[PDB]
Amino acid sequence: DNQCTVQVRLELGHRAQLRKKPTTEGFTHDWMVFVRGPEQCDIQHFVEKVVFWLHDSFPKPRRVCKEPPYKVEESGYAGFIMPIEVHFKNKEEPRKVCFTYDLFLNLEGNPPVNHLRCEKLTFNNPTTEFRYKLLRAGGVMVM
Ligand SMILES: O=C(NCc1ccc(CN2CCCC2)cc1)N1CCN(C(=O)c2cccs2)CC1
């Protein structure tokens, strides 16, 4: 008599623009990648940390945000595939979800890049504890 499914939403995104002039290092672009909730949700209730796995070419390429904003700001010269791990305040499975984020840059004279990726997470029969956190964050029951 106690089955329940709770949906929460995540937004992954990034912005990238051509620097007026390259940096010293010949970095041509500024970019920013993030994880956030939709308007008026606090994903920090169920998200323990977000880990952004930058290209090997970056120093300390494992970037952790343990609280909002969940984001990395950098300059560089090339797009790459970025693993993003979102770790949950969950005692049981699933403990985290792993995205493969396409961090692409604007070439030539293309406008700046401003992309959003909307992810719907479905938790089947979460524990009492974690269920609270999902709801506190503005998660929704699906019966
Ligand atoms: O833009 C960068 N690298 C991105 C990259 C490099 C090479 C490749 C290989 N791609 C294969 C197809 C074309 C390029 C992917 C991504 N970085 C890495 C180098 N870099 C830096 O060394 C630093 C920044 C701040 C402190 S040190 C920052 C800029």
Side-chain angles (χ1 to χ4, degrees), residues 6-8 42 45-46 88 123 126-127 129-140:
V6 169
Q7 284 192 133
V8 294
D42 185 10
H45 279 113
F46 72 89
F88 307 129
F123 298 90
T127 66
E129 268 273 301
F130 185 56
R131 176 168 69 204
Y132 291 139
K133 291 159 150 45
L134 290 169
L135 300 170
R136 270 163 215 138
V140 163

Side-chain angles (χ1 to χ4, degrees), residues 99-128:
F99 300 103
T100 306
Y101 193 82
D102 184 10
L103 189 87
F104 61 90
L105 302 185
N106 56 314
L107 50 78
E108 291 272 7
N110 284 336
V113 163
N114 189 0
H115 263 66
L116 197 69
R117 175 174 162 175
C118 296
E119 297 292 339
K120 191 189 317 202
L121 300 179
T122 300
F123 298 90
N124 295 313
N125 313 298
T127 66
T128 59

Side-chain angles (χ1 to χ4, degrees), residues 71-85:
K71 69 175 203 185
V72 176
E73 276 158 330
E74 276 291 358
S75 296
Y77 55 89
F80 61 94
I81 302 299
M82 181 187 295
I84 304 178
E85 289 180 345

